[PDB]
Amino acid sequence: MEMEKEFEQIDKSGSWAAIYQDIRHEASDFPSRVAKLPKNKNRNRYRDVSPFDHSRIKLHQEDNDYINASLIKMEEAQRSYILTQGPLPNTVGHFWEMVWEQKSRGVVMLNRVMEKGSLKCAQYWPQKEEKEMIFEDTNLKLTLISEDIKSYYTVRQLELENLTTQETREILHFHYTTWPDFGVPESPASFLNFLFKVRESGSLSPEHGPVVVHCSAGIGRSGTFCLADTCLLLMDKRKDPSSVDIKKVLLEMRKFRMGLIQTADQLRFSYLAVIEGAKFIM
Ligand SMILES: O=C1CCCc2nc3c(cc21)C(=O)CCC3
């Protein structure tokens, strides 16, 4: 079926939970043996969210190459994304090592450091120009260059320096700051505006390594971001945009990381975002 009318048909019939459970039943199951080794227990935020072995990102280290991160490679759309958990106190250096080694231009953050009174990820970037951060375990230096605070999101320019080679690179930090503590946003308008700002920066384009996107577990809000982007790109590329099937795209992405889209409300929000976004594109 088309999307917008399939949408009203699920609303009128109140069957979002049944649609979402079908997706969960059909999703791929692949091994995640490296994630479950005992030496990696303090590298995982949640025991039930792990990268598949076949698609995990490997650090270029011979001691321990493990990070909770996955490469989602979308062949028809010609887009790649790295989805990862919010960094932990003992993985902030690994996180920036990955950003360096994979040649990423942008980092997309969809959570606040504290939500619901609890810490959802480490404070992994510097907050003042004159107070830079040094990650001694991976030999990297990170400096805040500039910061632009808007009503729904903040963009930061960062400098990452490989202290071994003295090479430097500019990284863009795109921070969506207004996702509610419970539920999903009422309108997709500000999320779509944010997606378009990431696009316009070049961070999603083939001349850079894959964008790094995270929330707390790296599957819910993060899944919503890459699902909406890929679906909109396919609607631009194909002769028949109504052929784009958001459930099929989501199942393809779930071949590369488990659990993408965590609730039936997030599924409905993803439909809403693609539907509204397809009208603005033209
Ligand atoms: O933010 C939105 C909402 C509607 C869809 C949309 N499409 C475009 C933009 C922005 C948005 C741009 O600024 C450049 C490319 C076209």
Side-chain angles (χ1 to χ4, degrees):
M1 196 184 317
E2 175 190 61
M3 190 171 29
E4 172 144 36
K5 290 185 283 154
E6 190 197 350
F7 179 85
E8 320 238 45
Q9 198 241 321
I10 302 170
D11 257 7
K12 74 170 170 50
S13 54
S15 45
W16 282 109
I19 302 300
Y20 178 65
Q21 259 304 140
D22 297 348
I23 288 164
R24 292 187 59 160
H25 180 71
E26 287 296 328
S28 303
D29 190 22
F30 291 111
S32 311
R33 286 167 210 129
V34 179
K36 302 308 280 172
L37 298 173
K39 66 175 175 162
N40 293 325
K41 196 158 180 179
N42 77 340
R43 289 183 184 214
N44 295 309
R45 186 175 285 284
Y46 303 105
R47 57 152 178 71
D48 58 334
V49 181
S50 302
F52 299 140
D53 296 318
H54 81 86
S55 53
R56 72 183 183 96
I57 301 291
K58 299 178 186 184
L59 308 171
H60 300 176
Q61 224 254 105
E62 39 195 35
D63 170 51
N64 190 341
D65 69 5
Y66 177 74
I67 180 170
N68 194 317
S70 311
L71 180 64
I72 303 1
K73 190 171 184 195
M74 300 304 290
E75 185 170 26
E76 185 187 357
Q78 286 293 289
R79 278 270 222 258
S80 292
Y81 320 83
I82 294 167
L83 270 63
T84 191
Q85 70 187 10
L88 290 156
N90 61 296
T91 69
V92 175
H94 307 149
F95 177 91
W96 287 112
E97 175 187 3
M98 176 175 66
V99 168
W100 183 267
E101 288 167 354
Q102 304 299 317
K103 301 179 157 56
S104 308
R105 179 84 191 293
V107 174
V108 175
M109 171 169 185
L110 304 170
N111 66 291
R112 294 168 298 282
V113 165
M114 180 166 281
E115 300 180 4
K116 296 180 183 183
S118 301
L119 293 176
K120 296 296 167 195
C121 85
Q123 181 62 52
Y124 65 87
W125 73 94
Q127 292 177 285
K128 295 178 183 303
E129 286 88 339
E130 68 275 13
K131 295 277 205 192
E132 76 274 13
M133 291 178 77
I134 295 173
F135 305 101
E136 296 185 341
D137 59 334
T138 59
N139 216 33
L140 291 158
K141 179 175 105 173
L142 183 67
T143 306
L144 177 68
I145 298 306
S146 74
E147 178 167 66
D148 190 357
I149 299 172
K150 307 275 224 301
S151 45
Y152 291 91
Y153 69 99
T154 296
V155 190
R156 306 181 179 93
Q157 297 185 306
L158 308 172
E159 182 202 66
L160 187 61
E161 182 179 342
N162 178 346
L163 292 173
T164 301
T165 69
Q166 293 193 327
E167 308 169 285
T168 64
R169 279 174 213 161
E170 180 185 329
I171 308 300
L172 302 181
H173 195 242
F174 283 96
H175 187 181
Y176 189 83
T177 52
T178 54
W179 194 294
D181 269 10
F182 290 95
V184 303
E186 183 159 298
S187 162
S190 57
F191 192 70
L192 286 166
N193 188 60
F194 177 75
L195 166 62
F196 299 156
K197 296 295 186 187
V198 179
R199 277 185 176 194
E200 290 178 4
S201 80
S203 292
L204 290 164
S205 298
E207 65 249 22
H208 302 290
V211 70
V212 173
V213 349
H214 79 88
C215 44
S216 193
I219 59 175
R221 298 171 202 180
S222 290
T224 299
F225 183 88
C226 61
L227 179 62
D229 183 54
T230 286
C231 283
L232 290 167
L233 211 51
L234 292 170
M235 290 175 80
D236 271 346
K237 216 172 201 255
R238 286 187 185 175
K239 289 184 181 184
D240 178 12
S242 74
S243 70
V244 173
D245 185 339
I246 177 168
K247 301 188 260 49
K248 286 174 178 169
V249 178
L250 179 54
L251 286 164
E252 180 66 27
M253 292 184 162
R254 278 196 178 213
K255 297 175 180 175
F256 302 92
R257 185 168 178 85
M258 62 172 70
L260 305 179
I261 309 299
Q262 280 177 298
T263 65
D265 258 37
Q266 280 176 5
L267 186 63
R268 180 180 187 275
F269 181 75
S270 301
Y271 274 74
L272 266 184
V274 174
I275 291 169
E276 186 58 28
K279 309 168 153 158
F280 199 74
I281 211 116
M282 316 183 171

Coordinates of all heavy atoms in Angstrom, one line a residue, residues 87 92 95-96 107 109 111-113 121-128 131-133 135 142-144 146-147 154 156-158 173 175 177 214:
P87 N 28.4 7.2 24.6 CA 29.7 6.8 25.2 C 29.6 6.7 26.7 O 28.9 7.5 27.4 CB 30.7 7.9 24.8 CG 30.1 8.6 23.7 CD 28.6 8.4 23.7
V92 N 34.9 6.9 26.2 CA 35.0 8.1 25.4 C 36.2 8.2 24.5 O 36.2 8.7 23.4 CB 35.0 9.3 26.4 CG1 35.2 10.6 25.7 CG2 33.6 9.4 27.1
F95 N 35.4 6.1 21.4 CA 34.5 6.8 20.6 C 35.2 7.7 19.6 O 34.9 7.7 18.4 CB 33.5 7.5 21.4 CG 32.5 8.4 20.7 CD1 31.3 7.8 20.3 CD2 32.8 9.7 20.4 CE1 30.3 8.6 19.6 CE2 31.8 10.4 19.7 CZ 30.6 9.9 19.3
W96 N 36.1 8.5 20.1 CA 36.8 9.5 19.2 C 37.8 8.8 18.3 O 38.1 9.2 17.2 CB 37.4 10.6 20.1 CG 36.4 11.6 20.6 CD1 36.0 11.8 21.9 CD2 35.5 12.4 19.8 NE1 34.9 12.7 22.0 CE2 34.6 13.1 20.7 CE3 35.3 12.7 18.4 CZ2 33.6 14.0 20.3 CZ3 34.4 13.6 18.0 CH2 33.5 14.2 18.9
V107 N 29.0 14.1 13.8 CA 28.4 13.3 14.9 C 27.0 13.9 15.2 O 26.9 15.1 15.4 CB 29.3 13.4 16.2 CG1 28.6 12.7 17.4 CG2 30.7 12.8 15.9
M109 N 23.8 13.6 17.8 CA 23.4 13.3 19.1 C 21.9 13.6 19.4 O 21.5 14.8 19.2 CB 24.3 14.0 20.2 CG 23.9 13.9 21.6 SD 25.2 14.5 22.7 CE 24.5 14.1 24.4
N111 N 20.0 12.8 22.3 CA 19.7 12.7 23.7 C 20.3 13.9 24.4 O 21.3 14.5 23.9 CB 20.0 11.4 24.3 CG 21.5 11.2 24.4 OD1 22.1 11.0 23.4 ND2 22.1 11.2 25.6
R112 N 19.9 14.2 25.7 CA 20.6 15.0 26.6 C 21.4 14.2 27.5 O 21.1 13.0 27.7 CB 19.6 15.9 27.4 CG 18.9 16.9 26.5 CD 17.7 17.6 27.2 NE 16.6 16.7 27.6 CZ 15.7 16.2 26.8 NH1 15.7 16.4 25.5 NH2 14.7 15.3 27.2
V113 N 22.5 14.7 28.1 CA 23.4 14.0 29.0 C 22.6 13.5 30.2 O 22.8 12.3 30.7 CB 24.6 14.9 29.4 CG1 25.3 14.3 30.5 CG2 25.6 15.1 28.1
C121 N 24.5 9.5 28.9 CA 25.8 9.3 28.3 C 26.8 10.2 29.0 O 26.4 11.1 29.8 CB 25.8 9.4 26.8 SG 25.9 11.1 26.0
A122 N 28.1 10.0 28.8 CA 29.1 10.8 29.4 C 29.2 12.2 28.7 O 28.8 12.3 27.6 CB 30.5 10.0 29.2
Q123 N 29.8 13.1 29.4 CA 30.0 14.4 28.9 C 31.3 14.3 28.0 O 32.4 14.5 28.5 CB 30.2 15.5 30.0 CG 30.5 17.0 29.4 CD 29.3 17.5 28.6 OE1 28.2 17.5 28.9 NE2 29.7 18.0 27.3
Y124 N 31.2 14.0 26.7 CA 32.3 13.5 25.9 C 32.9 14.6 25.0 O 33.8 14.3 24.3 CB 31.9 12.3 25.1 CG 30.9 12.5 24.0 CD1 31.3 12.9 22.8 CD2 29.5 12.3 24.3 CE1 30.3 13.1 21.8 CE2 28.6 12.5 23.3 CZ 29.0 12.9 22.0 OH 28.1 13.1 21.0
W125 N 32.5 15.9 25.1 CA 33.0 17.0 24.4 C 33.2 18.2 25.3 O 32.6 18.3 26.3 CB 32.1 17.4 23.2 CG 30.9 18.1 23.6 CD1 30.7 19.4 23.6 CD2 29.7 17.5 24.0 NE1 29.4 19.7 24.1 CE2 28.8 18.5 24.3 CE3 29.2 16.1 24.2 CZ2 27.5 18.3 24.7 CZ3 27.9 15.9 24.6 CH2 27.1 17.0 24.9
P126 N 34.2 19.1 24.9 CA 34.5 20.2 25.8 C 33.4 21.3 25.7 O 32.9 21.6 24.7 CB 35.8 20.7 25.3 CG 35.9 20.2 23.9 CD 35.1 19.0 23.8
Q127 N 33.2 22.0 26.9 CA 32.1 23.0 26.9 C 32.7 24.4 26.9 O 31.9 25.3 26.6 CB 31.3 22.7 28.2 CG 30.5 21.4 28.2 CD 29.7 21.1 29.5 OE1 30.3 20.7 30.5 NE2 28.4 21.3 29.4
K128 N 34.0 24.6 27.0 CA 34.6 25.9 26.9 C 35.8 25.9 26.1 O 36.6 24.9 26.2 CB 35.0 26.4 28.3 CG 33.8 26.7 29.2 CD 34.3 27.2 30.6 CE 33.1 27.4 31.5 NZ 32.1 28.3 30.9
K131 N 39.3 25.2 27.6 CA 39.4 23.9 28.4 C 39.2 22.7 27.5 O 38.2 22.1 27.5 CB 38.3 23.9 29.5 CG 38.4 24.9 30.5 CD 39.4 24.5 31.6 CE 39.0 25.2 32.9 NZ 40.2 25.0 33.9
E132 N 40.3 22.3 26.8 CA 40.3 21.2 25.9 C 40.3 19.9 26.6 O 40.6 19.8 27.8 CB 41.4 21.4 24.9 CG 42.8 21.0 25.4 CD 43.5 22.1 26.1 OE1 42.9 23.2 26.4 OE2 44.7 22.0 26.3
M133 N 40.1 18.8 25.9 CA 40.1 17.4 26.4 C 41.2 16.6 25.8 O 41.4 16.7 24.6 CB 38.7 16.7 26.2 CG 37.5 17.3 27.0 SD 35.9 16.5 26.7 CE 36.1 15.0 27.6
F135 N 42.5 12.6 25.6 CA 42.1 11.2 25.8 C 43.4 10.4 25.7 O 43.9 10.1 24.6 CB 41.1 10.7 24.7 CG 39.9 11.5 24.7 CD1 39.7 12.5 23.7 CD2 38.9 11.4 25.7 CE1 38.6 13.3 23.7 CE2 37.8 12.2 25.7 CZ 37.7 13.1 24.7
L142 N 40.9 17.1 21.8 CA 39.6 17.6 21.3 C 39.4 19.0 21.8 O 39.3 19.2 23.1 CB 38.5 16.7 21.7 CG 37.1 17.0 21.2 CD1 37.0 16.9 19.6 CD2 36.1 16.1 21.9
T143 N 39.2 20.0 20.9 CA 39.0 21.4 21.3 C 37.7 22.0 20.7 O 37.3 21.7 19.6 CB 40.1 22.3 20.7 OG1 41.4 21.7 21.2 CG2 40.0 23.7 21.2
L144 N 36.9 22.7 21.6 CA 35.7 23.4 21.1 C 36.2 24.7 20.4 O 36.9 25.5 20.9 CB 34.8 23.8 22.3 CG 33.6 24.6 22.0 CD1 32.6 23.8 21.2 CD2 32.9 25.1 23.2
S146 N 33.7 26.6 18.2 CA 32.5 27.5 18.2 C 31.3 26.7 18.5 O 31.3 25.5 18.4 CB 32.4 28.2 16.8 OG 31.9 27.3 15.8
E147 N 30.2 27.4 18.8 CA 29.0 26.8 19.2 C 27.8 27.8 18.8 O 27.9 29.0 19.0 CB 29.0 26.6 20.8 CG 27.7 26.0 21.4 CD 28.0 25.6 22.8 OE1 28.2 26.4 23.7 OE2 27.9 24.4 23.1
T154 N 21.6 22.5 18.8 CA 22.8 23.2 18.8 C 23.8 22.5 17.9 O 24.0 21.3 17.9 CB 23.4 23.1 20.3 OG1 22.4 23.8 21.1 CG2 24.7 23.7 20.4
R156 N 28.0 22.5 16.9 CA 29.3 22.9 17.4 C 30.3 22.5 16.4 O 30.3 21.4 15.8 CB 29.6 22.1 18.7 CG 28.5 22.3 19.8 CD 28.8 21.6 21.2 NE 27.8 21.9 22.1 CZ 26.7 21.1 22.3 NH1 26.5 20.0 21.7 NH2 25.8 21.5 23.2
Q157 N 31.4 23.4 16.3 CA 32.6 23.0 15.5 C 33.6 22.6 16.5 O 33.9 23.3 17.5 CB 33.1 24.2 14.7 CG 32.1 24.7 13.6 CD 32.8 25.8 12.8 OE1 33.3 26.8 13.4 NE2 32.9 25.7 11.5
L158 N 34.2 21.4 16.2 CA 35.2 20.8 17.1 C 36.5 20.6 16.2 O 36.4 20.3 15.0 CB 34.7 19.5 17.7 CG 33.4 19.5 18.4 CD1 32.9 18.0 18.8 CD2 33.5 20.3 19.7
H173 N 29.4 18.7 15.3 CA 28.5 18.1 16.3 C 27.1 18.6 16.3 O 26.9 19.8 16.6 CB 29.1 18.3 17.7 CG 28.5 17.4 18.8 ND1 27.8 17.9 19.9 CD2 28.6 16.1 19.0 CE1 27.5 16.9 20.7 NE2 27.9 15.8 20.2
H175 N 23.4 18.5 17.7 CA 22.9 18.0 18.9 C 21.4 18.4 19.0 O 21.1 19.6 19.1 CB 23.6 18.6 20.1 CG 23.2 18.1 21.4 ND1 23.8 18.5 22.6 CD2 22.3 17.2 21.8 CE1 23.2 17.9 23.6 NE2 22.3 17.1 23.1
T177 N 18.2 18.7 20.9 CA 18.2 19.0 22.4 C 16.7 18.9 22.9 O 16.6 19.0 24.2 CB 18.8 20.3 22.8 OG1 18.2 21.4 22.0 CG2 20.3 20.4 22.5
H214 N 24.0 8.7 17.5 CA 23.8 8.0 18.8 C 22.7 8.6 19.6 O 22.4 9.8 19.4 CB 25.0 7.9 19.6 CG 25.4 9.2 20.4 ND1 24.8 9.4 21.6 CD2 26.2 10.2 20.1 CE1 25.3 10.6 22.1 NE2 26.1 11.1 21.1

